[PDB]
């Protein structure tokens, strides 16, 4: 199986799972630990912000790749905003300072 850019899930803007659904492989938690264990920092940043979640980040990425640029505009994971809405939907007031 192989995937460049397919469909995206609805509640958390991440790619779908499986093969029949044209999906991408789960860059799981222990692989995140194994990239923290090297000094690979930009590889992990695009591995969990640009390639996966941030929608404006990945459209900027796709334009930059088809123009030869090779550069990422990072932004924020949208699933972290989902975490803010689920914690905020309790009586808890989570924010982002400064």
């Amino acid at each position: 199986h192989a995937r460049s850019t397919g469909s995206y899930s609805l509640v958390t803007q991440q790619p779908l799972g499986g093969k029949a659904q044209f999906g991408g492989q789960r860059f799981g938690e222990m692989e995140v630990w194994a990239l923290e264990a090297y000094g690979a920092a930009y590889t992990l940043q695009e591995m969990l912000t640009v390639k996966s979640d941030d929608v404006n980040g990945r459209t900027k990425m796709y334009k930059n790749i088809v123009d030869g640029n090779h550069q990422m505009e990072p932004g924020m994971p949208e699933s972290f905003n989902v975490l803010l809405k689920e914690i905020r939907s309790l009586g808890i007031n989570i924010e982002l300072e400064d």
Partner: peptide
Amino acid sequence: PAGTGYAYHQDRMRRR
């Protein structure tokens, strides 16, 4: 703030 990003976090911690 460990690997390649330790220079970035040095820069951000210096520029506060």
